[PDB]
Design a protein around this nucleic acid. Structure first.
Ligand SMILES: [Mg+2]
Ligand SMILES: [Mg+2]
Ligand SMILES: [Mg+2]
Ligand SMILES: [Mg+2]
Ligand SMILES: [Mg+2]
Ligand SMILES: [Mg+2]
Ligand SMILES: [Mg+2]
Ligand SMILES: [Mg+2]
Ligand SMILES: [Mg+2]
Ligand SMILES: [Mg+2]
Ligand SMILES: [Mg+2]
Ligand SMILES: [Mg+2]
Ligand SMILES: [Mg+2]
Ligand SMILES: [Mg+2]
Ligand SMILES: [Mg+2]
Ligand SMILES: [Mg+2]
Ligand SMILES: [Mg+2]
Ligand SMILES: [Mg+2]
Ligand SMILES: [Mg+2]
Ligand SMILES: [Mg+2]
Ligand SMILES: [Mg+2]
Ligand SMILES: [Mg+2]
Ligand SMILES: [Mg+2]
Ligand SMILES: [Mg+2]
Ligand SMILES: [Mg+2]
Ligand SMILES: [Mg+2]
Ligand SMILES: [Mg+2]
Ligand SMILES: [Mg+2]
Ligand SMILES: [Mg+2]
Ligand SMILES: [Mg+2]
Ligand SMILES: [Mg+2]
Ligand SMILES: [Mg+2]
Ligand SMILES: [Mg+2]
Ligand SMILES: [Mg+2]
Ligand SMILES: [Mg+2]
Ligand SMILES: [Mg+2]
Ligand SMILES: [Mg+2]
Ligand SMILES: [Mg+2]
Ligand SMILES: [Mg+2]
Ligand SMILES: [Mg+2]
Ligand SMILES: [Mg+2]
Ligand SMILES: [Mg+2]
Ligand SMILES: [Mg+2]
Ligand SMILES: [Mg+2]
Ligand SMILES: [Mg+2]
Ligand SMILES: [Mg+2]
Ligand SMILES: [Mg+2]
Ligand SMILES: [Mg+2]
Ligand SMILES: [Mg+2]
Ligand SMILES: [Mg+2]
Ligand SMILES: [Mg+2]
Ligand SMILES: [Mg+2]
Ligand SMILES: [Mg+2]
Ligand SMILES: [Mg+2]
Ligand SMILES: [Mg+2]
Ligand SMILES: [Mg+2]
Ligand SMILES: [Mg+2]
Ligand SMILES: [Mg+2]
Ligand SMILES: [Mg+2]
Ligand SMILES: [Mg+2]
Ligand SMILES: [Mg+2]
Ligand SMILES: [Mg+2]
Ligand SMILES: [Mg+2]
Ligand SMILES: [Mg+2]
Ligand SMILES: [Mg+2]
Ligand SMILES: [Mg+2]
Ligand SMILES: [Mg+2]
Ligand SMILES: [Mg+2]
Ligand SMILES: [Mg+2]
Ligand SMILES: [Mg+2]
Ligand SMILES: [Mg+2]
Ligand SMILES: [Mg+2]
Ligand SMILES: [Mg+2]
Ligand SMILES: [Mg+2]
Ligand SMILES: [Mg+2]
Ligand SMILES: [Mg+2]
Ligand SMILES: [Mg+2]
Ligand SMILES: [Mg+2]
Ligand SMILES: [Mg+2]
Ligand SMILES: [Mg+2]
Ligand SMILES: [Mg+2]
Ligand SMILES: [Mg+2]
Ligand SMILES: [Mg+2]
Ligand SMILES: [Zn+2]
Lengths: 59, 83, 208, 99, 99, 138
RNA sequence: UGGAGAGUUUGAUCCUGGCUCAGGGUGAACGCUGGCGGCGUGCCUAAGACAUGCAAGUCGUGCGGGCCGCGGGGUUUUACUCCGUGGUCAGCGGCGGACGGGUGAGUAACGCGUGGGUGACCUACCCGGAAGAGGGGGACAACCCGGGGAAACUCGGGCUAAUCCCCCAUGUGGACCCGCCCCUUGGGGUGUGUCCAAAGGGCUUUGCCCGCUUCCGGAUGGGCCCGCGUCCCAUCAGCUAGUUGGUGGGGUAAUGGCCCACCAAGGCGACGACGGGUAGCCGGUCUGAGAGGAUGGCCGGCCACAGGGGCACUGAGACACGGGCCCCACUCCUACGGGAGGCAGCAGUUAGGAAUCUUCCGCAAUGGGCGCAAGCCUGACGGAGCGACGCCGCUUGGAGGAAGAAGCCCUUCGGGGUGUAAACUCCUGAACCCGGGACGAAACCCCCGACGAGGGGACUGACGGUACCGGGGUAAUAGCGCCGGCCAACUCCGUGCCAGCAGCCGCGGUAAUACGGAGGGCGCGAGCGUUACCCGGAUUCACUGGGCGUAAAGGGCGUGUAGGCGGCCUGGGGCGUCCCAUGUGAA
């Protein structure tokens, strides 16, 4: 589960992406943030597209 | 029977036919017997219609039936004209 | 679209002096006179020895930023020259200089390349009598790039066409100031264009 | 809900019925002739063979048998009839065998 | 034209039929080395005049049976039992490749 | 904020179904197409002021029950159902207890959840048990 | 006209060697963002199941009727009922439903590709040629009545028409047996014997037009056969009874064990039979320096399939996608005794999936079926629609403009950066508004002429009031990835092996260019990234182009089968090889 903080529970629907995490054993995939039940990362600003967060408007 | 008809080519909003002899059963643009000439219904070129009266005639003598507009075009290239 | 943004900022990055502004770029201030260094919080800090890649990259950018062209049209133009018979080096430039917008500028009608683009683009230019508004139009030997009616009386045009009085057009061309007409005579060549670019390097960039 | 390819099926059956009845005849008489031919009965053998030949060719004119098929049967029939007969035969009132 | 091949007879155990073994060489599509391969054809011998050991010309023909699509064209030479010994050995050998 | 496709409009008659070519203001009918639109959503011409009409409402459920399939194999069959169901009735809701992993199905009344489950069996081919939700102690 | 490499085993080194990355590509999907246009292109998964409409039909110039229209006749806006015309509905008859379109299931196979063979063959309609179209009978629908029934529609009797069916005749000719001649796998000729042809329909009436019969020939389209080529596993090694061959039959258009009798025992296999796995094949496409590798969506060719399986009928052609029969699976209707169905056609539904559309317009064009023709039909096709899915093109402005506003960020507090960027001044004028408005359409047809040639005349546009043109005219969108090394681009703050990053090496332990933010920068731009897969880098299966003493790798040693390879000289042949010509190598 990429990004700082998530909203995933024992029943959330996720979109798997492929790509392993070097320091984690049976971990061969990454959950795609911003799809189905995985909210984008909150307050993210930089690499936005990789963390399913929409461009923030200057309000 | 065998025929002499227009096979479409060119492109969308750019009709460019090919006067060809094919069995009446091939699809409109499928394999054909022989190409005898070409035709461009929009005269984008002075040379917008060529025919090989020689061959055209040959095929006519052997049964090949010209479709109407195929007939129109051949007539115009002077195939039926016996002078 | 094209670049549409700070131009002079590029002249400092390429170290050289680009002419993406016309008139100003002659006055005492193409920024190459004031801040001849790279833009940014840095710029005037020690410059590390350029990597083999950084050399070709910067040289290739140098040439492309000179014509306004996108990296897509640039590379496409390039691959075509490669295919072409002859020293891709020269040929490339040749195709770049054949571009319609360019020719208009190389003709005078426009103070700079961007302006030429807008001229061509706004139907002000005319090739062989018929109007063309496609900057990428390839001009061929023998064509006549000129102006148009509603276009002639125009303010900016007279200005730009008056500055041409006396001024001579590159060997490969032949302006006709009082007629606002002009012919594309010959395809240019490596020597005809005094470009601050080593094309041999651009060739090498496109290998990897 | 229905197309009229049904007429075609109707055609189908009747025609089927038709030439079905013709093929029986052909097989029967043919068999009948060769049976007699082996039995030494030259005259009636040949007599029946002629009838068969007619019925075969008559089948050929339409969509029942057709062409070489009819051509073929006749040959097999004649080939068979003649051979069996020269078992002390001599062709009486030479039917349909030029000889 | 009708394909014509030359091989030696290696089998006359059949009636009016002989087994002709034809060889052929060719450049390896990848490693270019010329290699020799071989194929066995059942050739029609109606007069039963060809026997085991003959090198003969085989010619493409109207099917005589399933498998027999060639007819013996003519004798090239006779007695090449040497050429048969090989094939037979090559075959005999198989009895030593199982389990 | 979604582009929808109104493939065809249709009037519900006392016996058959008439397929009309259009429906003007002040008239009611049913449209075929639209895969996203739900109850309460506003539909405006593909250009017209992208306004958002009033209406909808939706009272909050009054009773909750925990539901679990008959076999772990029917899990997604059930979940997929509940979801589909919460889509037609904004008054019915599916939630997952944060602490105790069970799935809490909720509606407007005993009778309500009754036709739901029963609807799950007959119309969705999923058989599930229902019971009082577990309690998160301390 | 064509070849780039880097990081990572060590204290350091050279080699070996694997992992990893930079590139190109896609029917794509996912994330962010999103202005236009053109041309392409869009169920890759459930060959799952499908509501609904539409995808072949067409002929009264083949034939008899039914119901209606209009008119004139006994008499009526009481024509009903009674000639005669234009329609209509089925039926009979014909031609087409074997083309077109869909799909990739099955198939490693003469399936396909390539080149050949047929003395072993077929070909409706179309051309060319020859000769005919003379008599005589008959039935079944339609229809009326009767019976079964709720219905589908069924059953009985009874007439009845033809280009429907049948007999006879003429036999240019043709078929068959036989004898002969030629020729050579069953081809060409010839003689006696036997055997086989037919429709009349419409007009400006013997003169034309469309049809009918036989034969010869042409074209076109096919069947069957053959050489060579066509994936992985040998931890699949033996396979085989219609099996291999013969004789005689059956069968078909034709060869063949194809099918069947009888005889003989053969046939195949390490040059990989048999078995299992996977797969439609090709033109091509992607990648690559090339040689290779991978691939076969779109388009063109063959093939195969049409809910699964089997089978014939009709026919020039089918064992037939919208024909038929039976079995299986499944679904629908019902007055519960039997009725109905088959989207891998267009479009659409539902299911599955990460995912791919209008139940649109039109027959104006091109092509197809029928008709003498008018014309009818054609979800082939021509177009339009939605989707950055792809590529190409265009825009968000141009020229001036400060040692240089503010804000924000650094700051050795002097100042430096954003940056000519903005403001600001002019100029041009995407959009939009107004006027006009296509090409694609000349022929079928009609007129003089012979229905010929030739000349002449008229009708016809879905796309569209669109493209384009003239006129007037507003400045009027910008995003996304990256900034430790490969690798192009740095600072401050927050944080403190926490939170996180991560393709590899590895960053994070309180000055982190490696995390999160900010300023700044580099790369691209109507986009940018990500994931998955393919080729490249991988000389990393080394044919081009690697290796085995110690890095992986010489079999424990002989003997020897197949196989591979083989000295000097001269002749023959000329298979390999080389050369030229020619065919083929579709588009
Ligand atoms: Mg990865
Ligand atoms: Mg990052
Ligand atoms: Mg009919
Ligand atoms: Mg009997
Ligand atoms: Mg035989
Ligand atoms: Mg290391
Ligand atoms: Mg290495
Ligand atoms: Mg070590
Ligand atoms: Mg170390
Ligand atoms: Mg489309
Ligand atoms: Mg599919
Ligand atoms: Mg239709
Ligand atoms: Mg229709
Ligand atoms: Mg059909
Ligand atoms: Mg087809
Ligand atoms: Mg397949
Ligand atoms: Mg398959
Ligand atoms: Mg197999
Ligand atoms: Mg072959
Ligand atoms: Mg072939
Ligand atoms: Mg027919
Ligand atoms: Mg004729
Ligand atoms: Mg009646
Ligand atoms: Mg009766
Ligand atoms: Mg007839
Ligand atoms: Mg006669
Ligand atoms: Mg005669
Ligand atoms: Mg005679
Ligand atoms: Mg007769
Ligand atoms: Mg008669
Ligand atoms: Mg083979
Ligand atoms: Mg036989
Ligand atoms: Mg035979
Ligand atoms: Mg068999
Ligand atoms: Mg196998
Ligand atoms: Mg298998
Ligand atoms: Mg390579
Ligand atoms: Mg290939
Ligand atoms: Mg497809
Ligand atoms: Mg294809
Ligand atoms: Mg099947
Ligand atoms: Mg299906
Ligand atoms: Mg079936
Ligand atoms: Mg089937
Ligand atoms: Mg038949
Ligand atoms: Mg059919
Ligand atoms: Mg069938
Ligand atoms: Mg079939
Ligand atoms: Mg269908
Ligand atoms: Mg469909
Ligand atoms: Mg789904
Ligand atoms: Mg579409
Ligand atoms: Mg329509
Ligand atoms: Mg049409
Ligand atoms: Mg037509
Ligand atoms: Mg289309
Ligand atoms: Mg400016
Ligand atoms: Mg103005
Ligand atoms: Mg027009
Ligand atoms: Mg015209
Ligand atoms: Mg006349
Ligand atoms: Mg005329
Ligand atoms: Mg004329
Ligand atoms: Mg018409
Ligand atoms: Mg660097
Ligand atoms: Mg980084
Ligand atoms: Mg673009
Ligand atoms: Mg390699
Ligand atoms: Mg080697
Ligand atoms: Mg090595
Ligand atoms: Mg060791
Ligand atoms: Mg070792
Ligand atoms: Mg040793
Ligand atoms: Mg050992
Ligand atoms: Mg040896
Ligand atoms: Mg030697
Ligand atoms: Mg040797
Ligand atoms: Mg020699
Ligand atoms: Mg030779
Ligand atoms: Mg050649
Ligand atoms: Mg050659
Ligand atoms: Mg050649
Ligand atoms: Mg070609
Ligand atoms: Zn400048």
């Amino acid at each position: 589960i990429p990004g700082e903080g998530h909203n995933l529970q024992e029943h959330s629907v996720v979109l798997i992406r492929g790509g392993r995490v070097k320091d984690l054993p049976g971990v061969r995939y990454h959950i795609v943030r911003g799809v189905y039940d995985a909210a984008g990362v909150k307050d993210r600003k930089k690499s936005r597209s990789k963390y399913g967060t929409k461009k923030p408007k200057e309000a | 029977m065998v025929k002499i008809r227009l096979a479409r080519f060119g492109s969308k909003h750019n009709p460019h036919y090919r006067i060809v002899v094919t069995d009446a059963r091939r699809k409109r643009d499928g394999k054909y017997i022989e190409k005898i000439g070409y035709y461009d219904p929009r005269k984008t070129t002075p040379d917008w219609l060529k025919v090989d009266v020689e061959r055209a005639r040959y095929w006519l003598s052997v049964g090949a039936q010209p479709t109407d507009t195929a007939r129109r075009l051949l007539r115009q290239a002077g195939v039926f004209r016996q002078e | 679209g094209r670049y549409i943004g700070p131009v002079c900022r590029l002249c400092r990055r390429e170290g050289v002096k680009l002419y993406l502004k016309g008139e100003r770029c002659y006055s005492p201030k193409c920024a190459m006179e004031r801040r001849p260094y790279p833009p940014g919080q840095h710029g005037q800090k020690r410059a590390r020895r350029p990597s083999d890649y950084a050399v070709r990259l910067r040289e290739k950018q140098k040439l492309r930023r000179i014509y306004g062209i996108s990296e897509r049209q640039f590379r496409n133009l390039f691959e075509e020259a490669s295919k072409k018979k002859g020293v891709t080096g020269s040929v490339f430039l040749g195709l770049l200089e054949s571009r319609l917008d360019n020719v208009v500028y190389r003709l005078g009608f426009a103070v700079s390349r961007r302006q030429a683009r807008q001229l061509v683009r706004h139907g002000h230019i005319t090739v062989n009598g018929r109007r063309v508004d496609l900057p990428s139009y390839r001009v061929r030997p023998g064509d006549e790039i000129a102006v148009a009616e509603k276009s002639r009386n125009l303010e900016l045009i007279r200005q730009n066409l008056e500055a041409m009085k006396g001024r001579k057009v590159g060997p490969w061309l032949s302006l006709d100031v009082e007629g606002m007409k002009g012919k594309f005579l010959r395809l240019p060549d490596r020597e005809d264009l005094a470009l601050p670019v080593n094309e041999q390097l651009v060739i090498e960039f496109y290998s990897r | 809900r229905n197309l009229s390819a049904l007429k075609r099926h109707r055609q189908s059956l009747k025609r089927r019925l038709r030439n079905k009845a013709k093929k029986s005849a052909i097989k029967t008489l043919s068999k009948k002739a060769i049976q007699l031919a082996q039995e030494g009965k030259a005259e009636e053998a040949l007599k029946i063979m002629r009838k068969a030949e007619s019925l075969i060719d008559k089948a050929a004119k339409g969509s029942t048998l057709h062409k070489n098929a009819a051509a073929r049967r006749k040959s097999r029939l004649m080939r068979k009839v003649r051979q069996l007969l020269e078992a002390a035969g001599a062709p009486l009132i030479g039917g349909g065998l030029s000889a | 034209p009708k394909k014509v091949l030359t091989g030696v007879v290696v089998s006359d155990k059949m009636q009016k039929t002989v087994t002709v073994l034809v060889e052929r060489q060719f450049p390896h599509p990848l490693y270019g080395k010329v290699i020799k391969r071989s194929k066995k054809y059942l050739a029609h011998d109606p007069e039963e005049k060809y026997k085991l050991g003959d090198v003969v010309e085989i010619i493409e023909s109207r099917p005589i049976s399933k498998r027999k699509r060639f007819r013996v064209l003519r004798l090239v030479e006779s007695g090449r039992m040497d050429l048969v010994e090989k094939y037979l050995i090559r075959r005999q050998n198989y009895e030593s490749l199982s389990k | 904020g979604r582009k929808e496709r109104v493939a065809r409009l249709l009037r519900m008659h006392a016996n058959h179904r008439e397929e009309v070519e259009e429906l003007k203001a002040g008239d009611l009918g049913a449209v075929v197409g639209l895969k996203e639109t739900i109850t309460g959503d506003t539909l405006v011409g593909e250009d017209a002021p992208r306004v958002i009409l009033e209406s909808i409402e939706v009272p909050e459920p009054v009773i909750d029950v925990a539901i679990e399939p008959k076999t772990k194999a029917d899990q997604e069959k059930l979940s997929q159902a509940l979801a589909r169901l919460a889509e037609e009735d904004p008054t019915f809701r599916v939630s997952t207890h944060p602490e105790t992993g069970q799935t809490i199905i909720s509606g407007m009344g005993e009778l309500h959840l009754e036709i739901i489950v029963d609807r799950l069996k007959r119309e969705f081919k999923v058989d599930a048990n229902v019971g009082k939700p577990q309690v998160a102690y301390r």
